[PDB]
Amino acid sequence: VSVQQSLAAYNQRKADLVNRSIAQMREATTLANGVLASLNLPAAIEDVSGDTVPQSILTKSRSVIEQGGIQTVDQLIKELPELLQRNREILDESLRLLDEEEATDNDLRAKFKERWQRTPSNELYKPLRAEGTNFRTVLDKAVQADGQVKECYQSHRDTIVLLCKPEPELNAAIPSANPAKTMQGSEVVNVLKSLLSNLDEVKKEREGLENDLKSVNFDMTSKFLTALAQDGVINEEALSVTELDRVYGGLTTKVQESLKKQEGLLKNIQVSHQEFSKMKQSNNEANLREEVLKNLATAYDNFVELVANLKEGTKFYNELTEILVRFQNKCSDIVFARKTER
Amino acid sequence: SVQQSLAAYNQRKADLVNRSIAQMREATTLANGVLASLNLPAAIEDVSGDTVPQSILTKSRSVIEQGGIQTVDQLIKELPELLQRNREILDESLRLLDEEEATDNDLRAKFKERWQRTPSNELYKPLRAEGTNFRTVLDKAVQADGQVKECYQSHRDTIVLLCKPEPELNAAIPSANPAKTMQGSEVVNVLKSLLSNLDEVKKEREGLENDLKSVNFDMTSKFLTALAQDGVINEEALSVTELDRVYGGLTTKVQESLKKQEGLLKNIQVSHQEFSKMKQSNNEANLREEVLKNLATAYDNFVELVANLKEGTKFYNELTEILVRFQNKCSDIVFARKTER
């Protein structure tokens, strides 16, 4: 039972757990924004005129504009498969080095009866090709994600372009309608307002936790060593699960709190929206205005999300290159030693 | 056998998942079909018998912006080409097999025991079986498509109108008489609430279809560990348990969904009965209602028809990859047979 192996294991546990928590939080936020959009919140409670852009939607629009709007997404999409294909090329060249050595090794075997005493290159390259298949898998998974991310984008593009238009053009595209006249400073609107600001602190807090989880750095090597130095054996599992609780248990606690705080807030939001629905218009034009406002909140969310995604994508791809360039060097160094001992 | 236990365990899971999803779809299709048959909610939005009811006009918004009748025309016309493409690949594949097998047969005639390699008919037994099975899938698809085209040719007329602008759509819905005393009556109130409930039910189903589909628990690892630990064990009884643990909470909600609709439809009929008393016993009203109804059938048919073609299209493209691999396998085999032997 080796130390190196046991550390690899621990670091996987810790990676898993962090990555699981972060995905729990992001999955939930997407869902919270999801529900608001389906309810025209916060837009509805800001729409006193019924012929101007609700402020929240305006803030959202400005924001998109501060981030280069549809140009940003376009350029990022334009260059992703190019980074993708650069990685493919290095892996192929990696695997080609091994296939070229092996071909000559085998040709040598067919010519030289007595080569049976030497182990064939075929065997030498087993772990390398195994690593190789794992890279083809990561790359193919990347392409598929890339596919949907594009599919999704192309369906949302037009509304995001609307969201980017100068404020006058923007306001001229939201059908005007009758205000809900009653809302203006009522009990349900005051309620929804605070409920909505609290849910906003839950979302905004979830970025601190994410950073807190990712920056916990603990020296596990010294404990694995200490244990070994003492009992003469390493129980990797019980040891890691113990220290992981100790160091992340506080933060994972908070995650489940954050998740449950959303669940109840979202529940109370639904109830207060019911009573707020009682004073809203069902003119044909009130529906037109509502559809368009909902499209705009959804459009923003997708923008933030497509912009998040593509950025993790290009960073991932870039840091993938460094990783494959080492693999190649390694393949090349193994082939060169093979080719050269004799 | 490990491979044989795993497949079964997975099949049992697909059943639970798919049969749940089926129950939703049929339930929603049924509800819509009942709402249409009673001209709701159009009836309770239709005060002046000379305007297009909001909800019908709104359904009309969806159709026009979904591409209208053009979108359904392209998809339906190219599905038979998509299916014809796939036949050709399967026929090339088997034809390669046929060529080589004829040459093999002839070589065993000329030379007898001086031609000792496995006969090609024996070698190609599972391939021709693959082919046969592919053929079954393509024949089923072709037949299921005829069923879609025929139904659609008998629908399209009404779907045509829905795509027209408001003015021209209205001049196809005859006039009847204003409904002066209905909007705000208690009967209409109770009904409007009933329909609002039923709207929340079929809505929350989408949230369950997704939740059902996108459960990503690794219940196969747990199983394969059990198969490591013990020898021969009770796989079926185990499956029952592990699925109740994972999917149990959702099947519960699914039945709670169906019961809720069961009862809501019951009350709606009761309310409609009472509604069919303040409304007209007019020839003219019967003829307006008749169109209203068909316009709602049309929208429901549009939606379901597009979803079907999109899904029919997706799988015929996917059937292609599958067939290319099978053709490449048939070309690789036939090549070795010519070359390596």
Side-chain angles (χ1 to χ4, degrees), chain B residues 177-208:
Chain B
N177 268 358
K180 284 179 171 54
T181 43
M182 68 107 177
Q183 210 158 64
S185 55
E186 311 290 350
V187 171
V188 166
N189 284 340
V190 166
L191 195 41
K192 182 149 130 181
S193 183
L194 271 21
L195 300 174
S196 186
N197 298 332
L198 179 57
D199 217 333
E200 296 321 322
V201 155
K202 88 168 180 146
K203 187 266 171 70
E204 79 169 61
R205 276 169 186 170
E206 295 200 58
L208 305 164

Side-chain angles (χ1 to χ4, degrees), chain B residues 34-85:
Chain B
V34 176
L35 289 189
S37 74
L38 314 172
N39 191 22
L40 297 157
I44 75 167
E45 296 162 347
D46 185 36
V47 305
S48 61
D50 67 18
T51 261
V52 200
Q54 332 176 38
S55 70
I56 295 259
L57 190 58
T58 281
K59 282 159 159 88
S60 181
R61 305 271 189 270
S62 256
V63 176
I64 295 157
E65 96 86 58
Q66 219 145 333
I69 218 158
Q70 286 89 74
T71 40
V72 169
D73 287 333
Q74 283 266 30
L75 287 160
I76 201 160
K77 92 108 159 180
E78 79 180 7
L79 227 64
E81 289 141 10
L82 282 181
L83 284 166
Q84 177 53 22
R85 167 175 281 119

Side-chain angles (χ1 to χ4, degrees), chain B residues 60-265:
Chain B
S60 181
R61 305 271 189 270
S62 256
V63 176
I64 295 157
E65 96 86 58
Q66 219 145 333
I69 218 158
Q70 286 89 74
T71 40
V72 169
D73 287 333
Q74 283 266 30
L75 287 160
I76 201 160
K77 92 108 159 180
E78 79 180 7
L79 227 64
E81 289 141 10
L82 282 181
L83 284 166
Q84 177 53 22
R85 167 175 281 119
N86 289 324
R87 291 254 170 189
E88 271 148 328
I89 300 167
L90 183 70
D91 295 342
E92 292 172 294
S93 288
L94 300 184
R95 198 211 79 186
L96 287 129
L97 302 189
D98 286 339
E99 184 271 332
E100 195 280 331
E101 167 162 6
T103 63
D104 187 60
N105 288 332
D106 182 67
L107 271 313
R108 332 181 86 86
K110 291 171 149 60
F111 320 119
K112 317 222 188 284
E113 279 210 83
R114 287 132 177 305
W115 198 252
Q116 301 209 330
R117 62 170 188 182
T118 297
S120 293
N121 49 53
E122 189 177 338
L123 178 63
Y124 302 157
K125 190 156 141 62
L127 296 171
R128 299 222 163 76
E130 269 177 291
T132 287
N133 298 129
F134 291 137
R135 213 148 54 214
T136 299
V137 161
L138 288 170
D139 286 354
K140 196 151 169 53
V142 157
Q143 187 191 6
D145 282 0
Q147 298 297 336
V148 163
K149 176 140 86 186
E150 216 86 47
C151 153
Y152 158 77
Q153 280 177 233
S154 302
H155 276 67
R156 58 136 43 216
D157 281 347
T158 307
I159 313 172
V160 179
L161 322 167
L162 258 167
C163 311
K164 304 192 195 305
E166 177 166 3
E168 299 206 304
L169 171 63
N170 183 220
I173 313 176
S175 292
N177 268 358
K180 284 179 171 54
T181 43
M182 68 107 177
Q183 210 158 64
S185 55
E186 311 290 350
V187 171
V188 166
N189 284 340
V190 166
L191 195 41
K192 182 149 130 181
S193 183
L194 271 21
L195 300 174
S196 186
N197 298 332
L198 179 57
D199 217 333
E200 296 321 322
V201 155
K202 88 168 180 146
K203 187 266 171 70
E204 79 169 61
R205 276 169 186 170
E206 295 200 58
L208 305 164
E209 183 166 314
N210 276 77
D211 291 4
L212 231 37
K213 282 212 213 74
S214 45
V215 153
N216 202 48
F217 184 91
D218 189 11
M219 34 182 299
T220 55
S221 286
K222 183 168 185 184
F223 182 72
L224 278 172
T225 312
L227 232 35
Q229 198 214 330
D230 295 301
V232 275
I233 52 80
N234 197 327
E235 295 156 7
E236 292 95 315
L238 187 38
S239 183
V240 159
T241 313
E242 180 76 8
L243 294 163
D244 153 283
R245 190 188 134 263
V246 180
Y247 291 98
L250 294 164
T251 352
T252 291
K253 279 161 143 171
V254 169
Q255 222 73 26
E256 179 215 335
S257 186
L258 298 172
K259 215 258 271 168
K260 206 151 153 60
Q261 160 179 328
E262 270 178 52
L264 268 155
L265 286 187

Side-chain angles (χ1 to χ4, degrees), chain A residues 93-104:
Chain A
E93 165 75 343
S94 296
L95 293 192
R96 197 201 48 81
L97 295 155
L98 315 180
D99 288 6
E100 172 178 20
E101 163 47 38
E102 215 211 307
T104 278

Side-chain angles (χ1 to χ4, degrees), chain A residues 28-42 196 199 262-263 265-267 269-270 273 294 297-298 301, chain B residues 203:
Chain A
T29 286
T30 302
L31 175 160
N33 290 340
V35 165
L36 295 196
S38 83
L39 301 179
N40 196 7
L41 303 172
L196 274 179
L199 173 57
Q262 160 157 332
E263 204 175 65
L265 276 166
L266 274 188
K267 174 200 179 160
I269 288 165
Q270 233 78 25
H273 181 269
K294 294 195 274 174
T298 280
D301 295 333
Chain B
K203 187 266 171 70

